Enzyme design. Structure first.
Site, PDB file in Angstrom:
ATOM      1  N   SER A   1       0.110  -1.171  -0.221  1.00  0.00           N
ATOM      2  CA  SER A   1      -0.262   0.021   0.108  1.00  0.00           C
ATOM      3  C   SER A   1       0.716   1.400   0.193  1.00  0.00           C
ATOM      4  O   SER A   1       0.531   2.525  -0.102  1.00  0.00           O
ATOM      5  CB  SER A   1      -1.003   0.016   1.210  1.00  0.00           C
ATOM      6  OG  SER A   1      -2.086  -0.538   0.673  1.00  0.00           O
TER       7      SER A   1
ATOM      8  N   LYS B   1       0.227   3.895  -2.996  1.00  0.00           N
ATOM      9  CA  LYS B   1      -0.657   4.843  -2.918  1.00  0.00           C
ATOM     10  C   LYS B   1      -0.375   6.329  -3.408  1.00  0.00           C
ATOM     11  O   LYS B   1      -1.149   6.952  -3.864  1.00  0.00           O
ATOM     12  CB  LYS B   1      -1.885   4.332  -2.008  1.00  0.00           C
ATOM     13  CG  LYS B   1      -2.606   3.113  -1.982  1.00  0.00           C
ATOM     14  CD  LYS B   1      -3.877   3.291  -0.759  1.00  0.00           C
ATOM     15  CE  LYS B   1      -4.309   2.580  -0.633  1.00  0.00           C
ATOM     16  NZ  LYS B   1      -5.182   2.708   0.328  1.00  0.00           N
TER      17      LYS B   1
ATOM     18  N   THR C   1       1.584   3.829   6.031  1.00  0.00           N
ATOM     19  CA  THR C   1       1.409   2.181   5.769  1.00  0.00           C
ATOM     20  C   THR C   1       1.014   1.427   5.320  1.00  0.00           C
ATOM     21  O   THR C   1       0.775   1.410   3.656  1.00  0.00           O
ATOM     22  CB  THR C   1       0.610   1.704   7.426  1.00  0.00           C
ATOM     23  OG1 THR C   1      -0.911   1.465   7.168  1.00  0.00           O
ATOM     24  CG2 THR C   1       0.482   2.039   8.414  1.00  0.00           C
TER      25      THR C   1
HETATM   26  C1  ID1 Z   1      -1.587  -1.939   1.823  1.00  0.00           C
HETATM   27  O1  ID1 Z   1      -1.098  -2.922   2.075  1.00  0.00           O
HETATM   28  C2  ID1 Z   1      -2.956  -2.551   1.559  1.00  0.00           C
HETATM   29  C3  ID1 Z   1      -3.678  -3.278   0.955  1.00  0.00           C
HETATM   30  C4  ID1 Z   1      -4.840  -2.021   0.625  1.00  0.00           C
HETATM   31  O2  ID1 Z   1      -2.733  -4.122  -0.490  1.00  0.00           O
HETATM   32  C5  ID1 Z   1      -3.769  -1.994   2.917  1.00  0.00           C
HETATM   33  C6  ID1 Z   1      -4.899  -2.828   4.001  1.00  0.00           C
HETATM   34  C7  ID1 Z   1      -4.078  -2.573   4.851  1.00  0.00           C
HETATM   35  S1  ID1 Z   1      -3.591  -4.811   5.189  1.00  0.00           S
HETATM   36  C8  ID1 Z   1      -5.273  -5.609   5.376  1.00  0.00           C
HETATM   37  C9  ID1 Z   1      -4.839  -7.261   5.832  1.00  0.00           C
HETATM   38  N1  ID1 Z   1      -3.910  -6.944   7.587  1.00  0.00           N
HETATM   39  C10 ID1 Z   1      -3.406  -8.199   7.413  1.00  0.00           C
HETATM   40  N2  ID1 Z   1      -2.800  -9.011   6.888  1.00  0.00           N
HETATM   41  C11 ID1 Z   1      -2.971  -2.300   5.080  1.00  0.00           C
HETATM   42  C12 ID1 Z   1      -2.285  -1.623   6.185  1.00  0.00           C
HETATM   43  O3  ID1 Z   1      -2.077  -1.846   7.369  1.00  0.00           O
HETATM   44  O4  ID1 Z   1      -0.721  -1.371   5.938  1.00  0.00           O
HETATM   45  N3  ID1 Z   1      -2.816  -2.008   3.976  1.00  0.00           N
END
Ligand code: ID1
EC number: 3.5.2.6
Length: 231
Positions: free
Chosen positions: A49, A52, A175
């Site tokens: 992410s 983004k 994050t």
């Molecule tokens: C990006 O890193 C993540 C998606 C958009 O790809 C987004 C969602 C959450 S992770 C969700 C799952 N949690 C544990 N496996 C996230 C983050 O917490 O950084 N980013």
């Protein structure tokens, strides 16, 4: 110019979570490394992410969206920056298109700059990869309005990344968690704007496990920034 810093205490912070992690700190072009797995700093990982940030810059620069557009909860690009929001940034990536995306990622030179043939998931499972040192350099350039994009576009994306303010310090960042690759990768990349205006950029990169709370990244970041007197 990239050296281990005073790492005695922060090394143990990562050890107590029983995982491997690095924290890269960039001041005015000096880069220091902290944590218990310093080789991670020059290792390529999927950005997850954290991409983004670049998606938003590219989409706004090329007028594929704007900061007021409501994506059908109904929400804006900036609201989606914080949330899971796979639909908004996937939709934006499809509007950009594979060709423009690859051209922009090559122009920026982000990581290995390879996005493959599927425009809406290349940041999560590959082939795009980037080192933590490259991420801290990218976000330092964003913080200083030094990326090759419109100044207004850079300001608008920066405004989407405010995580919190405390005692005159502003902490910006993004994050990421790549949960579907093995080993899992966790990111927290951003910068501190100190009260007098000085900028200190950071990239935290660590191995995640499924039982960890998402907040483990912020927890490790904050205790490390305090130990380094950055906040
Ligand atoms: C990006 O890193 C993540 C998606 C958009 O790809 C987004 C969602 C959450 S992770 C969700 C799952 N949690 C544990 N496996 C996230 C983050 O917490 O950084 N980013």
């Amino acid at each position: 110019a990239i050296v281990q810093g005073h790492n005695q205490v922060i090394h143990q912070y990562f050890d107590e979570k029983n995982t491997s992690g690095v924290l890269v700190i960039q001041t005015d072009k000096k880069i220091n490394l902290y944590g218990n797995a310093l080789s991670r700093a020059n290792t390529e990982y999927v950005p997850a992410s954290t991409f983004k940030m670049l998606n938003a810059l590219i989409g706004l620069e090329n007028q594929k969206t704007d900061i007021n557009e409501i994506f059908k909860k109904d929400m804006t690009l900036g609201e989606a920056m914080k949330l899971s929001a796979v639909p908004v940034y996937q939709e934006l990536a499809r509007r950009i298109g594979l060709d423009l995306m690859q051209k922009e990622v090559k122009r920026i030179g982000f990581g290995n700059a390879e996005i493959g043939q599927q425009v809406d998931n290349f940041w999560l499972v590959g082939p795009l990869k980037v080192t933590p040192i490259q991420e801290v350099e990218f976000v330092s350039q964003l913080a200083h309005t030094q990326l090759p994009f419109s100044e207004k576009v850079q300001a608008n994306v920066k405004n989407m990344l405010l995580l919190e303010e405390s005692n005159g310090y502003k902490i910006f960042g993004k994050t990421g968690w790549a949960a579907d690759i093995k080993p899992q990768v966790g990111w927290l990349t951003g910068w501190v704007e100190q009260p007098d205006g000085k900028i200190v950029a950071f990239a935290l990169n660590m191995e995640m496990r499924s039982e960890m709370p998402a907040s483990i990244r912020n927890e490790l970041l904050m205790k490390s920034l305090k130990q380094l007197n950055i906040i």
